[PDB]
Design a protein around this ligand. Sequence first.
Ligand SMILES: *[C@@H]1O[C@H](CO)[C@@H](O[C@@H]2O[C@H](CO)[C@@H](O[C@@H]3O[C@H](CO[C@H]4O[C@H](CO)[C@@H](O)[C@H](O[C@H]5O[C@H](CO)[C@@H](O)[C@H](O)[C@@H]5O[C@H]5O[C@H](CO)[C@@H](O)[C@H](O)[C@@H]5O)[C@@H]4O)[C@@H](O)[C@H](O[C@H]4O[C@H](CO)[C@@H](O)[C@H](O)[C@@H]4O[C@H]4O[C@H](CO)[C@@H](O)[C@H](O)[C@@H]4O)[C@@H]3O)[C@H](O)[C@H]2NC(C)=O)[C@H](O)[C@H]1NC(C)=O
Ligand SMILES: CN1CCC(NC(=O)c2ccc(Nc3ncc4c(n3)n(C)c(=O)n4Cc3ccccc3)cc2)CC1
Ligand SMILES: Cn1c(=O)n(C)c2nc(Nc3ccc(Cl)cc3)ncc21
Ligand SMILES: [Ca+2]
Ligand SMILES: [Ca+2]
Ligand SMILES: [Cl-]
Ligand SMILES: [K+]
Ligand code: NA
Ligand SMILES: [Zn+2]
Length: 805
Amino acid sequence: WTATSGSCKGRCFELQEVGPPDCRCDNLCKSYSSCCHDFDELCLKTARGWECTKDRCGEVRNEENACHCSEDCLSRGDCCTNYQVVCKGESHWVDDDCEEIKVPECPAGFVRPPLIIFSVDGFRASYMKKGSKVMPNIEKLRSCGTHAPYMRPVYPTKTFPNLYTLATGLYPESHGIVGNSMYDPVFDASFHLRGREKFNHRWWGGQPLWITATKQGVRAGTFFWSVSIPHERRILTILQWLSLPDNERPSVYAFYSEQPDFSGHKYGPFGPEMTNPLREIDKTVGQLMDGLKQLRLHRCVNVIFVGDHGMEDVTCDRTEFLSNYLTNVDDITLVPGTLGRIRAKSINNSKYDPKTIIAALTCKKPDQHFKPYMKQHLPKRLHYANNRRIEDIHLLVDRRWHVARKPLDVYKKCFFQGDHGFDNKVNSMQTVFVGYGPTFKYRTKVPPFENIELYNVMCDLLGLKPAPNNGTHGSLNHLLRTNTFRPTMPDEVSRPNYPGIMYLQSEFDLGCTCDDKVENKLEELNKRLHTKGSTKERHLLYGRPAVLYRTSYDILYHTDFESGYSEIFLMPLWTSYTISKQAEVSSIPEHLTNCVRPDVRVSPGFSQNCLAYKNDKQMSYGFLFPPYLSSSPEAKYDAFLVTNMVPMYPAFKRVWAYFQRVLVKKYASERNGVNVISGPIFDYNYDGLRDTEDEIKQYVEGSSIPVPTHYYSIITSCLDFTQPADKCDGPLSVSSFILPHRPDNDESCNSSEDESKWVEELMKMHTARVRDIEHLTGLDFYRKTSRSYSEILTLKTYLHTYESE
Ligand SMILES: *[C@@H]1O[C@H](CO)[C@@H](O[C@@H]2O[C@H](CO)[C@@H](O[C@@H]3O[C@H](CO[C@H]4O[C@H](CO)[C@@H](O)[C@H](O[C@H]5O[C@H](CO)[C@@H](O)[C@H](O)[C@@H]5O[C@H]5O[C@H](CO)[C@@H](O)[C@H](O)[C@@H]5O)[C@@H]4O)[C@@H](O)[C@H](O[C@H]4O[C@H](CO)[C@@H](O)[C@H](O)[C@@H]4O[C@H]4O[C@H](CO)[C@@H](O)[C@H](O)[C@@H]4O)[C@@H]3O)[C@H](O)[C@H]2NC(C)=O)[C@H](O)[C@H]1NC(C)=O
Ligand SMILES: CN1CCC(NC(=O)c2ccc(Nc3ncc4c(n3)n(C)c(=O)n4Cc3ccccc3)cc2)CC1
Ligand SMILES: Cn1c(=O)n(C)c2nc(Nc3ccc(Cl)cc3)ncc21
Ligand SMILES: [Ca+2]
Ligand SMILES: [Ca+2]
Ligand SMILES: [Cl-]
Ligand SMILES: [K+]
Ligand code: NA
Ligand SMILES: [Zn+2]
């Protein structure tokens, strides 16, 4: 109940929302059905439209007008945005040359440059170039300020998850808004775009920027506008708020536009009908900048122009139907469209079986346009699993396609030509970022970055301490002229041991054998030097990784590689080696095919054993440093040490062997040498964070050897590839992956073919940021480079995408 008989007199777009049954006058009252009786009359004036005309100049103030052109309007803060241009001979902001804003030029009373976030729905990255002719204001912001060629959204590339990620710095799995539609089994409640459940604060986790600001004494405009409030009125309202007295005036504001998304759904991303919506958004930007210029705020305010996601061509005819795969389609609930989420229709149906649903959906049709996954098997880069609102069964849908349950859903629920929600690596899903203002750099292009990073920067812009989030604070320092955040590297928690030779061969009873007993002083001093770290500078190029948790581990040196060997997990946490462009690939000699050798530096009690692998009929083993890349026949023996062995399903060994035999050498010739760091990951609770030992769900049979859920590699070289990886003077280049350690290759539909036809495609799907690997391992890489730390943080957030240009 709302007693709508109160009045909005002197309260129009009030900042503190009042509680029922008192009537509301705030920018959200329409959405709640709660505005006072006179809200439209008082607050949503439209008379005479939005622009001054020559004949309105110096008019007598008429309070009925949408905006004003009377002499008193500047001090009332409610002129039409074009007032000074029509009536005082001023120029539009877009018509002025740009001039560097070296310092904030703010009116007296402003304690800090205000921040205005101008968010646009569905604004695909390529619109900046393709629509440039029709967006002069946006183009001026972009060319004069700081811009990226695109900004990566989060998955799913839908509105609610992305706008709330922008506000919180959090992955959707952590903030809880995991789609536009959701079922929470604990609440037993559904969240929908339409209706009232979505207003309940229990859906919305983390701490959004407006709450962060408020808690720290920085006032915020409200970030949500009821859909029927026209854009011109939103802008006018922001500009009025900016004329409040110092003690009442917010420092942070948001504008949101439903366009171009609204039209993009109807006409497709590049439909000829899209030109007008882009012109109209540009006009809105121009109104804001002219309004800021009138208020003398145009060289004071930091403006962020940012999109939530892009838009792809999608039509009704490109729909896969689950009824073409499943016989039991009526026993499931699907969240449909550009992604699929499946659960049981009824919790009382014990006949329902996710394993058989996944199998009926796996590689069933030659050009199948979706791929089923258990959520924990989705590419780790999506960070889309650790939330009870995310169903166990997920469908990754090919770009340009939809999935639906049955054909009747698509014609009894062609309209649309555009949609979005696909994998956030897809080019059509990328969106925009421009920052303009005293705190952003002048005419500066920055590399693409992820939207999870922006919260930290918006907090920096406002002098706020960010709440804990998924950005890497400092990785966007290069966007900013000042207010940088200067982090220090995390402290190492565990120091390594450096074991020497401590055990005789006969102390080991591991069931391992090797044909290696075949007997020099010219060469004996050499092997000793190599075991003491003499080649370490070649193979450990960026210092050893730091271990950021409490554990027992040993550094092991060898001719061709260095490792940090965990006495707790019985295998390396990391293995580091450099492969030059000149390196040769050799084979594993016949006599060494099943060779595993005790490591006399490491006790039998802290070693794996070969018998466990013999006895485990499902599990085999592989090596972290590959024997194929040994530098000499003698060095090759090191690669067969029991301390370089890791457990691997045979199906995964297909993937791993091709990576190690073929791809590493390929990358070394392409990139002019690579440094490789490889290791295991254990994430049995799919939270994106390193498991402790008591979280491990699977061991090699009859042993305490834990089975990794994933294997990673970080492949680093010189950004200037005219320099070899091991003699690089400048910035680095990186690519990484986190490969799921699976007992089948069901994910890869072409896997009965030669690894040259499917392995590299698999690895590209599982591309990763170094930062993802850090979270998953508790390691901190690139500790000793000649680069600035902020630069290394940017490098750690880099994702090599494998999308065209
Ligand atoms: C991305 O960034 C984020 C933000 O930094 C990272 O997420 C953080 O990770 C932390 C480590 O997992 C985690 O810390 C835990 O907090 C528990 C208290 O949680 C509440 O309070 C905070 C603070 O305000 C709040 O943010 C939380 O909000 C979550 O939950 C609400 C309600 O469900 C949601 O609305 C909201 O969206 C958010 O949900 C997300 O996180 C939860 C987990 O907290 C997930 O379950 C959800 O799926 C969702 O993703 C909470 O309201 C605290 O109780 C924990 O302490 C336990 O563990 C310690 C180990 O130190 C142990 O010593 C304790 O004994 C304790 O264990 C006990 O409870 C166990 C479970 O019942 C039980 O098994 C034991 O036997 C013990 O009894 C823990 O410290 C922090 O909450 C989140 N924060 C957020 C916002 O998500 C995220 O990791 C980053 N991602 C990556 C990949 O890096
Ligand atoms: C065919 N059509 C398809 C799309 C349909 N429409 C919708 O689904 C819709 C409507 C209105 C809004 N509005 C909205 N405004 C501000 C938001 C916000 N959502 N969220 C989630 C935030 O966090 N902030 C705060 C903020 C503001 C600015 C930046 C960051 C965060 C969203 C989506 C209509 C039909
Ligand atoms: C910050 N940064 C950047 O601007 N580029 C262009 C980068 N590229 C890479 N990696 C990379 C990897 C494989 C190949 Cl073949 C080429 C480049 N890492 C970091 C990068
Ligand atoms: Ca959207
Ligand atoms: Ca984990
Ligand atoms: Cl959804
Ligand atoms: K075996
Ligand atoms: Na297969
Ligand atoms: Zn949309």
